[PDB]
Design a protein around this ligand. Sequence first.
Ligand SMILES: *[C@@H]1O[C@H](CO)[C@@H](O[C@@H]2O[C@H](CO)[C@@H](O)[C@H](O)[C@H]2NC(C)=O)[C@H](O)[C@H]1NC(C)=O
Ligand SMILES: *[C@@H]1O[C@H](CO)[C@@H](O[C@@H]2O[C@H](CO)[C@@H](O)[C@H](O)[C@H]2NC(C)=O)[C@H](O)[C@H]1NC(C)=O
Ligand SMILES: *[C@@H]1O[C@H](CO)[C@@H](O[C@@H]2O[C@H](CO)[C@@H](O)[C@H](O)[C@H]2NC(C)=O)[C@H](O)[C@H]1NC(C)=O
Ligand SMILES: *[C@@H]1O[C@H](CO)[C@@H](O)[C@H](O)[C@H]1NC(C)=O
Lengths: 66, 412, 98, 49, 49
Amino acid sequence: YQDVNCTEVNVFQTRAGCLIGAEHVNNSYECDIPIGAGICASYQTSQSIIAYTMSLGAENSVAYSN
Amino acid sequence: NSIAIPTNFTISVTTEILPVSMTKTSVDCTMYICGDSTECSNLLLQYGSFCTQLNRALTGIAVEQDKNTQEVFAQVKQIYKTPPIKDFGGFNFSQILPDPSKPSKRSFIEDLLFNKVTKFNGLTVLPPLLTDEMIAQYTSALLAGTITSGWTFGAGAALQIPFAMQMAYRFNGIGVTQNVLYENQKLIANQFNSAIGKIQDSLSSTASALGKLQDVVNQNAQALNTLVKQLSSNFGAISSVLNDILSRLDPPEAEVQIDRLITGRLQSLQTYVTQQLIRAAEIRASANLAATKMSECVLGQSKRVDFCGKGYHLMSFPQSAPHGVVFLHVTYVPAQEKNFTTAPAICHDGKAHFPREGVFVSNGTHWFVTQRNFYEPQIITTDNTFVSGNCDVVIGIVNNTVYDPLQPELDS
Amino acid sequence: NGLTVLPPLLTDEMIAQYTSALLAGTITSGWTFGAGAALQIPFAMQMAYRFNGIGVTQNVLYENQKLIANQFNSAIGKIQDSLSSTASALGKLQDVVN
Amino acid sequence: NSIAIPTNFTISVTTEILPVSMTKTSVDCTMYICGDSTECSNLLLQYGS
Amino acid sequence: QSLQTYVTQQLIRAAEIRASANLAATKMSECVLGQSKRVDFCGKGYHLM
Ligand SMILES: *[C@@H]1O[C@H](CO)[C@@H](O[C@@H]2O[C@H](CO)[C@@H](O)[C@H](O)[C@H]2NC(C)=O)[C@H](O)[C@H]1NC(C)=O
Ligand SMILES: *[C@@H]1O[C@H](CO)[C@@H](O[C@@H]2O[C@H](CO)[C@@H](O)[C@H](O)[C@H]2NC(C)=O)[C@H](O)[C@H]1NC(C)=O
Ligand SMILES: *[C@@H]1O[C@H](CO)[C@@H](O[C@@H]2O[C@H](CO)[C@@H](O)[C@H](O)[C@H]2NC(C)=O)[C@H](O)[C@H]1NC(C)=O
Ligand SMILES: *[C@@H]1O[C@H](CO)[C@@H](O)[C@H](O)[C@H]1NC(C)=O
């Protein structure tokens, strides 16, 4: 529900509006279905639609030395 | 017979600003034309798909706006980060690297960029998929990669290299021998550090610096304001207000007045959408250019002239900006020059000697061989030149001597 | 009927100063006027530099310098014969004007 | 086991022709849509911008 | 409607010329101010100037 707070309508809050029927996941995975403002959603674990903040990639410190 | 060869150089940093995206607007064609009116909506349906194909066209634009952002910034498979110890050979990158004390880890310069670039009619705005924070993480990764692994992270794995050595390669890539960098490393680092400070002073004081991004915002704002103002037009109707027509006329007459408003308002949306599609194409072309530069400017080193700023390109660093990307292009520019006498070749024993690299120069009494992009005279020897043909062929060939390093070893 | 044609800001005489500047730079200084200030270099040494750019050893220029000068001069001659005889060579510019 | 190495060169000047601008037309639309007519102009104002 | 048709055609035609001005500007920068390693960018052959 774009640009509607969840008080004007499972439920997950996003900057893009009020998501309903998507299971919020604290983990992060690569974008599957783009919801906007970072959040991306997928059909994954027994199966359900999850919604999550997207992974940008595997984090990596380059072993830089002088 | 005269060549000018630079004796000194300056490292300059220039800023190139490109639009990447535009506001992802979305317009409800039914609500815009027939806001909360059943009588008007039923008339609107007589126009078939004219309404919904506009909703489709605007959606298509909104989607490619995320594509544009993704193609420009998400060119790195991993998020790289710099070490806690900034041992980069004297080169200070603290003003382009992320600031950990901020609510959003943006660099000092990025904050400057963000601080310079600035209804109920069915008109809404969708958020971008990649938030400013996510863009900052991508530019951080690209920057950390550029600094600690040079171009290797673009091709494959990020392979660590001392920054000073990375610069040595960057110098060889522009035809300047690597010893120049090391001998002048302190000068180069100081010129670089000063150039960055100049970037901040320019961006912090010249509002027009970000005109390319501010203009995009202004064009889109103007397009929406125009669209909304059109609702006040009568288009031949007794009133621009739909409810005033309905509250005053019976259907057999109200429908006529409403059709006049529908035609005008439907035409207004078509005009708006067409302009957005054309404008979107312009932005897409800019985004494609920005993506090309990211790959061929930040991830690599450009041999393409004036592609990555004026001068000989060394390296570039991306910075994010509202709806766009800003590139700081670090280039090598010859600074001071002298007039030398030259020759295409030198005669020794009747043999014609040509430089393997560099040119022959004369200071008026002695001939030397030196690099074209920096004056560094060397004795002409058989290890600097090669022989082909003889003195009777080359126009402008001059007499000198070519030293043979072997002679004294066998002589003694 | 309300139609007008605004003039260009650069007159075709100013365009011809800019192409003469680009060209007098290109001839006397090679690429160097794009990197910095123009650095003079003799034209027989500028083409020797461009032959190294295509990987041809620069003595292949000096040992053939009259042949190369003559092929450049003859090839510029064919441009006049083409453009004087064949009005359809300008097809893109006449298409835009049409 | 065979390579062909060119023993000569032919310096070729090729013309490439590119559009760079087009005619800066501009139209006073209020003259084109309604020419010297007050009655028509007042009706054209009902179309807003 | 007949003026909007002209202006829409000119806006699309101006994008077609703008992409040709940027290609001419790019060829000016890489071919004239430089020497191009890009194959067939400056006509058939290995580019000299
Ligand atoms: C190349 O130019 C730099 C300046 O851009 C010279 O460095 C300066 O030298 C003067 C003394 O003559 C000092 O007062 C300045 O403070 C120096 N500036 C910097 C940034 O170091 C450098 O010496 C010149 N090199 C050569 C070989 O001529
Ligand atoms: C990189 O440059 C910054 C300046 O932009 C240096 O930070 C300053 O350090 C001095 C002390 O020497 C303080 O008085 C300033 O207030 C600091 N300014 C800022 C903006 O932090 C920084 O130390 C330099 N880093 C290196 C490694 O040379
Ligand atoms: C470069 O040196 C050669 C000798 O090594 C010069 O050759 C002389 O040319 C003159 C004029 O034809 C003859 O009279 C001499 O007998 C030649 N000398 C020898 C030893 O054969 C040549 O002229 C010199 N070129 C320049 C430009 O100084
Ligand atoms: C080279 O000689 C010319 C002679 O006209 C002079 O103007 C120019 O300044 C000289 N260049 C240098 C670097 O001395």
